[PDB]
Design a protein around this nucleic acid. Structure first.
Length: 145
RNA sequence: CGCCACUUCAUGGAAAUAAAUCACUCACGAAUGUCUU
C-alpha cells in the first residue's frame, strides 16, 4: 500500500473499526462472507473498477445485489467502507502505475517474463489489498473455541 | 267448436403473472523447525 494518500487512512480506520476488542460496548459486526465474495468476484470487480464514469455506482449496486438478504442490513457500513477503500486504492494505483506499465510494455530490451513481473495491474492490486485487509481482520477476530 | 305441430342445442375472451435464485459459519487446526551415525 501507498502511505501517501487517504487509502492508508481508510485502511487503518477499517482495521480499527472491524477488529474485536477484548471483553469489557459493542463492535461493528464484521462479516466473513465478503472475504470469499471479493476473491471469487475479483474479475467482475476489475471490470467495475475499469468503468470510469459509473465506478462508484456500479460498485455499490454490485455489493447491494450480491448481499441482498435480511442479515446484510447490519453490514452496510462494512460494505460502504470497503467500497471507499477499493475506489481510493484503484485511483492511487492508476495514478502511480499507468504510465509505468505503458512504458514497461513499450520497452524492447526486457523479456516477457520480466515484463510481467514488473507490470502490476492497478485494479487487481487494489482488490488484493482489500482481500488481505479483510483476511487480517478475520484472522485477528476469529478464535477456535 | 272441431282438428293439428314444427324450429333452435356454444360461441367469443383470459391459457399463467410477480417475489425470493442460495444465505450464515468454518477457508485449514495440532505435531515436527531437524534427528541418528
Amino acid at each position: 500500500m501507498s502511505k501517501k494518500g487517504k487509502s492508508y487512512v481508510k485502511f487503518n480506520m477499517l482495521l480499527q473499526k472491524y477488529i474485536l476488542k477484548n471483553k469489557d460496548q459493542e463492535s461493528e459486526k464484521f462479516l466473513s462472507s465478503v472475504i470469499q465474495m471479493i476473491r471469487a468476484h475479483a474479475e467482475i470487480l476489475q471490470i467495475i473498477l475499469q468503468n470510469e464514469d459509473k465506478r462508484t455506482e456500479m460498485l455499490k449496486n454490485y455489493f447491494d445485489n450480491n448481499f441482498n438478504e435480511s442479515c446484510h442490513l447490519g453490514y452496510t457500513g462494512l460494505f460502504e467502507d470497503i467500497q471507499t477503500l477499493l475506489c481510493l486504492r484503484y485511483q492511487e494505483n492508476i495514478q502511480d502505475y499507468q504510465n509505468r506499465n505503458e512504458i514497461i510494455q513499450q520497452n524492447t530490451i526486457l523479456t516477457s517474463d520480466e515484463k510481467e513481473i514488473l507490470i502490476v495491474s492497478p485494479a487487481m492490486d487494489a482488490i488484493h489489498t482489500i482481500f488481505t485487509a479483510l483476511q487480517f481482520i478475520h484472522f485477528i477476530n476469529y478464535n477456535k473455541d
